[PDB]
Design a protein around this ligand. Structure first.
Ligand code: NA
Ligand code: NA
Ligand SMILES: [Zn+2]
Ligand SMILES: [Zn+2]
Ligand SMILES: [Zn+2]
Ligand SMILES: [Zn+2]
Lengths: 278, 278
């Protein structure tokens, strides 16, 4: 059911696996993510950006997740604000029923980042909500101080290829769950699916699978995944548009799109190590 | 709020206007219908087919509607099962929170249609839910008996050019709200939008706007509207896919798709006479 972010990630931290954090913007994305978790027996970290929240309305973002939660009550799921930008934004998410919030203040100096993170932490912890923050390449010594002072629950350190030595140093010093941002891999089958549907990816490349695996071994426990899901989703939509010019049944477009998105999530759950962890 | 279908249609009945009954299959469709109703100050009839219920899950179908209703508490909204095909399906919609159900038994002989409709009515009225049934072209004396025996709240008479004389006789004999099925009126702007995006409608003919207006003057009060919405929506999706083969932000595909659907709903509400009726 709907649980504090730290419940899922403390366990990932202790046992040494990564929990994919999958963004959604509507019902179709959320359904395929949830079906993936059900089929892989995997905990679900559900993410909504400020943009997706404005699109849906926070009442709907939370409401739909709560419906999905009742549909699979055996799956632990956290509802997590991805890249909150202001304290007020984090407070609204907490009020709306999110069980995890990220405040991104990494563009500030250390002292200002720490003070804004600490403000969000106080508010969220008072309502029983976990907090993510961002630092950074990250200075591991200030990461150590940042975590001890802010009491944030998980940290996204800037490590990039990936600086795996820096990651192990941050992990050793902070002893908390760590988050990797922009962690989509853009797999070969998804890119081939998107190009077969006529799409163009501008030669964009993700983090290869072996580097995701190595970052989990380095101590990453939350793995932000968004871009992969969208490319796998829209490529089916583009395909359906191309092949039947008379097709306007939305289900005919989004049923295969859901299936491709679900498959990306399933595979990523297996890759990161959250498969069969319920 | 979520009200009995009869509550909305009894008012439409007494005042001689039509209320569009708009199908939905996911959040995007539902959001745009509601924004249309909010901007036209019109009551909302929201319809979900057995197919769309399967696609969403009846718990999500009702759950999303209940969230939207709290977002616009001032709007009268009925949640209606479109073309229910078994008693059991009607009973499931009633138990899940639908406030109106249609049992489609029009392929049966008069006696079996009446028997099945009556069984639905006893069940649905016990739970405070309104019932639609279907007959037919329609025999108006059959309609008069059917309505008086079944106590169904509204009836879809098969009247389709559309037989105005027959509609008026049915209206006179039954004196209940009447519903018009297959009443999408593929508007020129919408058709041009679909074709401009490379769509192919196969030369499908929609009901002329004047024939929708004449049915409302004849006593139609619920106008089933689906195809029009899906064409407008998918037209924008095809457009976004065409004009940027690197676009896979779902909001970029569906925000304009919502707006096009909303505009269809707004114009229909004005056409049928439900604008400014709250
Ligand atoms: Na985040
Ligand atoms: Na109906
Ligand atoms: Zn950032
Ligand atoms: Zn970041
Ligand atoms: Zn129909
Ligand atoms: Zn029909």
């Amino acid at each position: 059911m709907l649980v504090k972010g730290n419940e899922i990630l403390l366990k990932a931290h202790k046992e040494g696996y990564g929990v994919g954090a999958f963004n959604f913007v509507n019902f179709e994305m959320l359904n395929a993510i949830f079906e993936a978790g059900n089929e892989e027996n995997s905990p679900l970290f559900i993410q909504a950006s400020e943009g997706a929240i404005k699109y849906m309305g926070i009442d709907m973002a939370v409401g739909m997740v709560k419906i999905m939660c009742e549909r699979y009550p055996h799956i632990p799921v956290a509802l997590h604000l991805d890249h909150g930008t202001t304290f007020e934004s984090c407070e609204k998410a907490v009020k709306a029923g999110f069980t995890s919030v990220m405040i991104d203040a990494s563009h500030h100096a250390f002292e200002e980042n720490l003070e804004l993170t600490s403000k969000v932490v106080k508010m969220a912890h008072n309502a029983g909500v976990s907090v993510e923050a961002e630092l950074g390449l990250v200075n591991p010594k200030e990461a150590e101080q940042f975590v001890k002072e802010s009491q944030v629950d998980y940290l996204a350190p800037a490590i990039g290829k990936l600086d795996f030595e820096r990651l192990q140093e941050v992990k050793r010093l902070t002893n908390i769950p760590l988050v990797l941002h922009g962690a989509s891999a853009i797999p070969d089958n998804v890119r081939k699916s998107y190009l077969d549907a006529g799409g163009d990816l501008k030669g964009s490349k993700g983090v290869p699978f072996e580097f995701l695996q190595e970052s989990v071994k380095g101590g990453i426990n939350k793995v932000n995944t968004d871009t992969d899901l969208r490319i796998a989703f829209i490529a089916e939509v583009r395909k359906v548009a191309n092949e039947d010019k008379s097709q306007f049944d939305l289900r005919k477009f989004f049923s295969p799109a859901q299936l491709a998105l679900k498959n990306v999530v399933k595979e990523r759950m297996k890759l990161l190590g959250s498969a069969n962890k319920i």
